[PDB]
Amino acid sequence: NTFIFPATFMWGTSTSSYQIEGGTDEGGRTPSIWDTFCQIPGKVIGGDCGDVACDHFHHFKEDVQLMKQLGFLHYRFSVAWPRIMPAAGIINEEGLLFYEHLLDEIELAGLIPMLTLYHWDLPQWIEDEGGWTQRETIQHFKTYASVIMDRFGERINWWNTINEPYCASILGYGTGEHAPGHENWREAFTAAHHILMCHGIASNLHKEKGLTGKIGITLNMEHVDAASERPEDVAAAIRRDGFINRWFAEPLFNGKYPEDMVEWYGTYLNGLDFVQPGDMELIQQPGDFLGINYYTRSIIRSTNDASLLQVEQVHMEEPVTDMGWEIHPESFYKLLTRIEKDFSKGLPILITENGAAMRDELVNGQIEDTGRQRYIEEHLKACHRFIEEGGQLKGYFVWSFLDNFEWAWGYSKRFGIVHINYETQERTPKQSALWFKQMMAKNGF
Numbered sequence: 157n158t159f160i161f162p163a164t165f166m167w168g169t170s171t172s173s174y175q176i177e178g179g180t181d182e183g184g185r186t187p188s189i190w191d192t193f194c195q196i197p198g199k200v201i202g203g204d205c206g207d208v209a210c211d212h213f214h215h216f217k218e219d220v221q222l223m224k225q226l227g228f229l230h231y232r233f234s235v236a237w238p239r240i241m242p243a244a245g246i247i248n249e250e251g252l253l254f255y256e257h258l259l260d261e262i263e264l265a266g267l268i269p270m271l272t273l274y275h276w277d278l279p280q281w282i283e284d285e286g287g288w289t290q291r292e293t294i295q296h297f298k299t300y301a302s303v304i305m306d307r308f309g310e311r312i313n314w315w316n317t318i319n320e321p322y323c324a325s326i327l328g329y330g331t332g333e334h335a336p337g338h339e340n341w342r343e344a345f346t347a348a349h350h351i352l353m354c355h356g357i358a359s360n361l362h363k364e365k366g367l368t369g370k371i372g373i374t375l376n377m378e379h380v381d382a383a384s385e386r387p388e389d390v391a392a393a394i395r396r397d398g399f400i401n402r403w404f405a406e407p408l409f410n411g412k413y414p415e416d417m418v419e420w421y422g423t424y425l426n427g428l429d430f431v432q433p434g435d436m437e438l439i440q441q442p443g444d445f446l447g448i449n450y451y452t453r454s455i456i457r458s459t460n461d462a463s464l465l466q467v468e469q470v471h472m473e474e475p476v477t478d479m480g481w482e483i484h485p486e487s488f489y490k491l492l493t494r495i496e497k498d499f500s501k502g503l504p505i506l507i508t509e510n511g512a513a514m515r516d517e518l519v520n521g522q523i524e525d526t527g528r529q530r531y532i533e534e535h536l537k538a539c540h541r542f543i544e545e546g547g548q549l550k551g552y553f554v555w556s557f558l559d560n561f562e563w564a565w566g567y568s569k570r571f572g573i574v575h576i577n578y579e580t581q582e583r584t585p586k587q588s589a590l591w592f593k594q595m596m597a598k599n600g601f
């Protein structure tokens with residue numbers, strides 16, 4: 157009953173720049189959309205902001221060393237657009253220097269980096285111009301992505317372009333739940349089209365510059381089950397699946413948007429007027445691999461309410477994380493299977509994010525996060541069954557090396573395998589982290 161993974165399998169850990177760096181107003185960095193958003197009353201639990209966070213801006217050498225020490229060969233992180241383009245066409249050298257050094261430290265410990273271009277921290281000055289609702293924002297991205305590839309690229313083995321287009325567009329402009337916080341479906345779908353284009357943009361810059369590092373986008377995806385055998389519930393579930401998965405996965409592989417969702421979004425798509433000749437072609441670039449972020453499944457039922465989808469999520473109080481997120485490892489296996497069948501059909505799949513937030517309690521310098529634990533192991537068995545059955549899973553990055561600013565949840569939630577004491581900033585590996593070390597050692601469990 158042991159679970160062994162390929163010899164070539166990629167074992168990593170990942171983070172996000174705004175979620176851990178801190179030093180928000182240091183080194184030339186100008187405010188990102190989240191620095192603003194977090195000030196809006198009621199948007200983030202406790203009113204928390206990304207100020208300081210894990211202060212990884214100052215503790216990076218210790219952190220990376222802590223990774224090496226923890227047995228990690230791969231590390232996915234993101235570049236804060238704000239540190240690079242603090243204003244229109246400027247280019248802060250002090251920002252690039254920070255990452256360059258980070259890379260010196262990474263390579264010095266013998267780790268393999270994966271740089272994520274955009275992880276939701278859009279410069280405020282750009283949102284002022286209209287942010288993602290403006291096609292003009294795409295050129296701003298081109299500028300940003302070009303500098304990053306010119307300054308590095310030779311040392312970047314893996315390029316992760318956009319992280320969860322869904323969240324940055326639907327939640328950021330549609331539901332108002334993520335920065336910048338707009339509530340306008342017309343803008344959400346427009347923003348979703350512009351951010352997907354940026355993946356194509358960075359893909360074109362990639363090949364144009366002749367880089368050798370693999371490249372790909374990351375899509376957060378969730379398995380969807382109908383709440384009952386009732387027709388409308390099955391209909392509801394289909395709608396949720398197209399809302400989060402198909403709307404972003406379809407254009408990336410099939411060069412088109414889900415016909416049914418397009419039909420359903422009626423007047424909100426405004427005749428799909430934000431699409432221009434070439435856009436879909438630009439977007440349809442799977443690249444070298446598909447990055448996936450999975451956390452939980454969705455159980456849907458239908459409603460006849462005033463919301464966009466008219467779908468209701470059943471709240472399975474069953475095994476759940478500190479976020480109320482149900483733990484259903486079977487669904488992860490089911491999603492991975494479905495993704496290979498449609499979309500990827502063979503292409504290498506990479507899990508750029510997977511983990512959980514449980515209530516942590518520090519006991520005698522140790523965190524017995526058995527829970528987080530029963531979560532990573534169980535989902536890894538899911539990943540093991542997908543392989544063994546022919547799945548193309550080539551890597552897994554446990555999400556959140558460090559506890560961090562958990563977006564709308566603020567610091568009220570802990571996703572790390574390394575516990576952060578915010579009063580002192582000291583790092584203390586949790587039991588799950590040690591388990592992961594011994595796990596990667598036997599390359600299985």
Ligand SMILES: OC[C@H]1O[C@@H](S[C@H]2[C@H](O)[C@@H](O)[C@H](O)O[C@@H]2CO)[C@H](O)[C@@H](O)[C@@H]1O
Binds near residue numbers: 320378451452564
């Ligand atoms: O904030 C913790 C964790 O969030 C997710 S994305 C998350 C959306 O916030 C939520 O509204 C929706 O129901 O589910 C998705 C995923 O199931 C993000 O991927 C992760 O990086 C972050 O640490």
